[PDB]
Every structure is written in structure tokens, then in C-alpha cells.
Amino acid sequence: DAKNIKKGPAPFYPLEDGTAGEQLHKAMKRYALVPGTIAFTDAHIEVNITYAEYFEMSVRLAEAMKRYGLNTNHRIVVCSENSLQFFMPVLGALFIGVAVAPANDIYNERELLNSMNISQPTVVFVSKKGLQKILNVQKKLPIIQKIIIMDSKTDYQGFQSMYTFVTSHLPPGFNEYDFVPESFDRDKTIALIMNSSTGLPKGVALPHRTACVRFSHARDPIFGNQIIPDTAILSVVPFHHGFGMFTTLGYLICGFRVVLMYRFEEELFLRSLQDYKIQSALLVPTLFSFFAKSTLIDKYDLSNLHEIASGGAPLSKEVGEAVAKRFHLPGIRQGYGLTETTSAILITPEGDDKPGAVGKVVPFFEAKVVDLDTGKTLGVNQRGELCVRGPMIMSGYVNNPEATNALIDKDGWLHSGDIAYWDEDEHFFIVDRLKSLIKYKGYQVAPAELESILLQHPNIFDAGVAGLPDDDAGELPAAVVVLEHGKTMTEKEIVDYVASQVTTAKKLRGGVVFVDEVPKGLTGKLDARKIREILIKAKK
């Protein structure tokens, strides 16, 4: 077919040679040479840290870790809330080819253990508030030999800070500017090990190459940001996640000022947009919903604001438009991306906005929609499973080749598990499963509504509502239910409960199938297709 495969255009900035650490080192060094160039600004404490300070500390950490004994056979974990220190160990490791595994700072000790059990780090960089948890985790992971405090100058509770640690290992006469970052295979050397649906979170190994490709996107006038002097971004998204991770590294390449927030607050956010003359703001999905409700925006001079982005998270046409209207902008930038694709592979092009579209295939990439049955490449405006192929796809899940293979096929295509379609202009649309609708004899009911009702019951922990196909009525509303531990409930009780809450048209006639876990998709949304499958297989 050929024409049925959407390809991203030629990048504005060619993919450059070198490892991610080399490209980062090169970029930051030139910025460091210009005194006063701001790298990060903490909106809460108002402190600015320049590229010179950042470059020098990162280079010192790279050398110190090298001297300590870390190389490509090692991994480090960075567990911290967004801060001015966050990227210091990240850059240092990338400079020497040590894999960085960002651990979610609000992970309870159990999720924390799982993540690090996968990453197996030799050294752990942590913020003061994450120390206790990390120590408890260390007891269970013998590979963790050294803990280093990020947000401290002097030692802290018997542990070295990044500063004292550096001093303990740098050779005499060390020159930050004479330092040369390690050179290595950008394809086999892992840069980041990020945490990902159903089951326990996995480790996504991302080779230096994916970051290198990302750096091209970052400065693309159409798919990223034009490198203009005095560009400031307000990032409230977590650094340990792909959205925050890969947007920031790109910003560092572009020499932008990254204003950060680790705790959301309405007034502080808007005042920051104003005072720091922010051009782009990055928000997590639920914060878009929040701003659609905000009535304080008009009180601030946001003349410089041009972009509000969602990264790899798709947004409903309603929420996007609501937010854009509130901020008096023609639209918002969204895109589709997975941890497994490094960052967004479908992005809203500058000047090429289209209502309801998630965006277009990014340079270096190609995407298609395939038949859920035949697996054959579908055509224009035809809905099927989104598959993508490009140099930013992960190398695989750490120590889980089975899961890798179930996601990435022989031809390099990653099966997203999400349904979408592209139009005559190559704009993609992600089918919102929340808008799916079940039709009982013409009457329509949103699965989300019934789920809201089920989740409302003291005995129900989780629920997934999907339409059990029925020839005599179109569809019968049914649900897979995960009971709260220790509680007992019958299908009848559940059905009767639903009935006492909805119109005779929205009754759970399809019935209930008790499952231990409701099937989720990589997006982090319920998987209607699997729920349907379970319901069918169970009902004779």
C-alpha cells in the first residue's frame, strides 16, 4: 500500500553525531561560557542556577563517579521531587555512559522497591525527604553500595552530599572545562531506564540514541521550540517521568531557562507565567481540567505565553478547547507518546492545528493503523490499532524480553494497543474510550458513568464497564468487577445496586464478571476490548 503509512517529515535539525552525554556536554559548555545564562529557576525559593554552575557541577559529578568506579556496567537511581539539583547526577551519568533510573518520589516503599529491583543501581542519589525510604530499600537490595544526598551542601545524617562526594573523588587540579565526556555506542548504551498498565511497573531501557533523536525534535520550529534567546518554560510535570525528563534535556540543549515547580498552586503558577515571562507551560492532564475551571487568568499579564503542552498525553477536544479559551490561545499543543517511545511521536505541529486531532507523525518516525484481526495496514479515516516505528522506540523492558516481544514485532513496529485513525491531511485522532458509548435498543450510556456508580460501592474496589454484544438489543451493559479485599458481593447484588441508581435504559443487564484486575492499556486507561473479551468468554 505504502501511501497508508504516515511518515514524519525531514527534521529541521539533522540528527547529530555523538552520545546523548556528548551532545548535552557540548551544548551546555557553550552556554556555561556566557555568565548569567539561567538553566533552572526554582519558582518556590526563587533561586536561579546558571548554565556555568550546572555544567561545572555535572562535569564534576561525571568525573567523580568515573573515579569511584562506575562505567557502562552500572546504573544509578535519582529519587527526588523536581528540584534545582535533579539533573546534576542525570547529566553526570550521561556524560560517562552510566544508565540513569529515575524513581518516582511519591512511590510508597513497595513501588520504590519494585522499580529499583529492576534497575539494580550501584549508587543512589536522593533528596533528604526520600532518605528513609531509600535506606529501607537498601536493606533489601545488596547492590546499592552508596547513597548520596542531592539537596545538601555538607554531609547529611552521615551521608555525603553531591558536593562532598565530588571532593572525595576528583583528582587534584581537575579542570571542568578540560573534561571530555565518554564516547561509546549510542545504540547499545542505555541512557535512561524509565518506569512504565496491568501488573507491576516495568523498566523501559532507552538507548542514548533515543535522546539524540529527541534533541532534534526539541529545536524543531514545527515539532518543538525555535531556539530564540531568553526563552523560559514553566514545568510542573515530574522530571522522573518521560514528559518532564525528555522535555528538560531538550531545553538544556536549547539553552532555555527552565522554571520549575514541585508543588502546584494556582496563584504561584499564574504569577510565575507572568513574572518569568514564560513562553511555554507544561501540565499534567488533570491540571488541564483544573485550568478549565480557573477564573483568575485575566488578572495576569501573560502576553509572552504561547504554548501550553500535554506531552505524550492526549486530551479531549473539550478540555483542550476550554483551556485554550481560558488562556486566549488559538489552541494547545498535545501529542501521543508512551514511555516506550521515549516521548511524543505524534505532536501538534506549529501552525497546523486541527480540532480533535492529536497531531502528526514526528520526524524520524512512521505510524499506521492496523486491523485488530488481520493485522493488515488499514487506509484513510479507518479505525484500527496504532502502530509506530522509529529510532526512539525502547530497546526493551529490562529483564523481560517476553513483554518486549509482545509489544514490538519483527519489523520494529510497536503495537500501542490504542485505536486511532488518520485523515486526508495525515492528522491523527486517538479514539477516546470514554466517549465509546454502549447502545441498548438505541438508548446510549457512557461506560464511565456506570463505572462511577460501581466504584461508589463500599464493596467494589475497581470496575470496568463494556457492552456485551447482544443481537436482540444491540448491547447489554456489563462489567468486570474487582471486589475490595475481604468483602463478598454477588452479581445479583451488584446488578440490583446499579438498577437502584439508573434509568431503566442504563441497567447492568449484561451482568458481572468478577476479576482480580481490570485490564488497562499502556495509555493508563481501561481496555474496553479485553473487558469485552472476558465478558464474552465467561457468558457461555
Side-chain angles (χ1 to χ4, degrees), residues 2 4-109 111-131 133-187 189-375 377-401 403-409 411-423 425-438 440-442 444-470 473-487 489-503 505-524 526-528 531-532 534-536 538-539:
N4 280 342
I5 290 184
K6 308 289 84 174
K7 293 99 167 173
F12 170 78
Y13 219 95
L15 180 64
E16 299 208 292
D17 298 307
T19 77
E22 290 182 312
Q23 306 197 21
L24 281 165
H25 180 274
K26 181 172 178 289
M28 297 180 75
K29 186 167 175 174
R30 69 182 162 217
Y31 297 128
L33 296 185
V34 187
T37 306
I38 312 178
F40 290 95
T41 302
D42 182 309
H44 303 273
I45 62 176
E46 294 169 65
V47 177
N48 294 280
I49 182 168
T50 62
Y51 271 93
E53 293 164 82
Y54 228 90
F55 171 76
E56 289 167 33
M57 187 57 188
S58 300
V59 161
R60 285 168 61 95
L61 271 162
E63 183 70 24
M65 286 187 276
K66 173 168 176 172
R67 295 286 176 166
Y68 177 83
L70 307 186
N71 54 64
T72 59
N73 291 304
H74 305 81
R75 296 153 302 278
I76 58 161
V77 156
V78 174
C79 182
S80 180
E81 56 278 4
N82 286 6
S83 68
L84 296 174
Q85 296 74 39
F86 195 96
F87 283 86
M88 290 172 178
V90 175
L91 293 177
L94 296 182
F95 288 173
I96 57 171
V98 167
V100 182
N104 186 333
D105 66 301
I106 50 164
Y107 262 170
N108 50 14
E109 277 168 48
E111 300 171 299
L112 200 50
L113 185 67
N114 175 227
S115 182
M116 300 178 78
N117 190 83
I118 295 176
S119 58
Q120 293 290 317
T122 300
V123 180
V124 180
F125 286 90
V126 71
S127 69
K128 296 168 172 172
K129 67 193 293 176
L131 186 55
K133 288 178 288 173
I134 294 298
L135 284 175
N136 296 345
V137 168
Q138 177 175 52
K139 289 167 174 164
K140 297 178 174 50
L141 293 176
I143 192 168
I144 297 173
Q145 305 178 330
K146 177 78 167 170
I147 307 304
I148 298 167
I149 307 304
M150 293 165 71
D151 53 341
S152 189
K153 288 301 174 61
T154 59
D155 291 334
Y156 175 82
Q157 299 192 6
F159 296 91
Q160 291 202 293
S161 66
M162 301 190 302
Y163 290 83
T164 56
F165 168 74
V166 145
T167 300
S168 299
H169 306 276
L170 289 182
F174 182 68
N175 195 123
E176 301 82 7
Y177 294 76
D178 288 344
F179 172 86
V180 177
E182 294 298 288
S183 182
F184 46 71
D185 189 63
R186 58 148 80 151
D187 296 331
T189 315
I190 302 304
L192 281 307
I193 293 169
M194 312 297 290
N195 287 117
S196 62
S197 51
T198 317
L200 278 182
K202 311 190 199 68
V204 175
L206 302 178
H208 280 250
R209 180 198 65 249
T210 74
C212 299
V213 175
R214 168 62 199 169
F215 297 160
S216 174
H217 293 158
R219 55 200 299 176
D220 197 291
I222 306 300
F223 296 77
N225 294 118
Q226 296 180 10
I227 301 185
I228 294 168
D230 298 320
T231 298
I233 311 298
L234 182 55
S235 182
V236 73
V237 295
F239 289 166
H240 59 70
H241 184 252
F243 190 17
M245 175 58 67
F246 298 100
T247 47
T248 307
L249 293 179
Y251 294 152
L252 294 176
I253 285 295
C254 297
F256 297 161
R257 176 187 191 178
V258 180
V259 187
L260 65 89
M261 279 182 75
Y262 47 85
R263 295 181 301 100
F264 176 76
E265 294 188 18
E266 192 180 3
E267 289 166 293
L268 179 61
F269 181 87
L270 296 167
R271 191 174 58 255
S272 289
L273 288 178
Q274 170 182 275
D275 292 357
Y276 298 116
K277 306 172 171 175
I278 303 292
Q279 277 82 14
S280 309
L282 308 182
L283 300 169
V284 299
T286 47
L287 286 182
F288 268 93
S289 308
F290 170 89
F291 277 111
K293 303 164 178 176
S294 180
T295 65
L296 287 171
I297 294 162
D298 291 1
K299 282 178 174 174
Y300 301 84
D301 177 356
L302 306 176
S303 46
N304 289 283
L305 182 64
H306 175 267
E307 172 189 5
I308 297 182
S310 64
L315 297 173
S316 69
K317 178 182 152 164
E318 288 65 42
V319 177
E321 295 181 321
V323 178
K325 193 176 187 296
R326 286 287 199 195
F327 285 96
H328 314 294
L329 297 175
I332 63 144
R333 166 171 269 158
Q334 52 175 312
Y336 179 88
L338 301 178
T339 306
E340 293 83 355
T341 63
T342 299
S343 47
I345 49 194
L346 296 181
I347 294 181
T348 304
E350 179 66 55
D352 205 350
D353 190 28
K354 192 175 207 158
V358 78
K360 293 191 165 181
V361 182
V362 299
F364 296 114
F365 265 74
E366 60 194 333
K368 62 174 180 175
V369 296
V370 305
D371 191 272
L372 292 166
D373 304 293
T374 63
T377 303
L378 301 180
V380 206
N381 292 299
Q382 292 160 35
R383 331 239 178 301
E385 183 179 2
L386 180 62
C387 291
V388 292
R389 195 166 61 160
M392 260 177 22
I393 304 296
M394 61 164 182
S395 61
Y397 293 117
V398 173
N399 289 109
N400 190 358
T404 304
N405 298 328
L407 190 66
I408 307 166
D409 66 38
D411 302 326
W413 292 93
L414 168 146
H415 297 289
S416 67
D418 283 22
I419 287 71
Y421 70 89
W422 41 275
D423 58 23
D425 292 312
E426 300 182 310
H427 276 106
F428 277 79
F429 300 78
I430 300 300
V431 180
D432 195 353
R433 93 101 202 164
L434 292 174
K435 284 180 165 178
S436 55
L437 296 184
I438 304 170
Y440 178 66
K441 292 174 170 176
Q444 295 173 352
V445 60
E449 190 191 329
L450 298 174
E451 290 162 10
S452 198
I453 293 185
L454 290 173
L455 289 166
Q456 188 170 337
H457 207 274
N459 292 353
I460 300 180
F461 169 57
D462 204 12
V465 180
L468 170 62
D470 180 55
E475 289 184 284
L476 283 182
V480 293
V481 172
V482 179
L483 293 181
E484 210 75 63
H485 174 264
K487 326 218 70 171
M489 196 162 180
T490 79
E491 173 190 41
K492 176 181 179 56
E493 293 183 304
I494 296 176
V495 173
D496 289 346
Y497 162 63
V498 173
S500 68
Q501 303 282 250
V502 291
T503 76
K506 304 170 154 178
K507 289 176 173 173
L508 251 212
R509 301 176 192 272
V512 175
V513 174
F514 295 108
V515 301
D516 306 311
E517 199 167 16
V518 177
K520 306 269 173 47
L522 293 174
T523 357
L526 298 180
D527 182 33
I531 299 172
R532 223 125 53 198
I534 303 173
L535 291 164
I536 295 177
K539 304 299 168 178

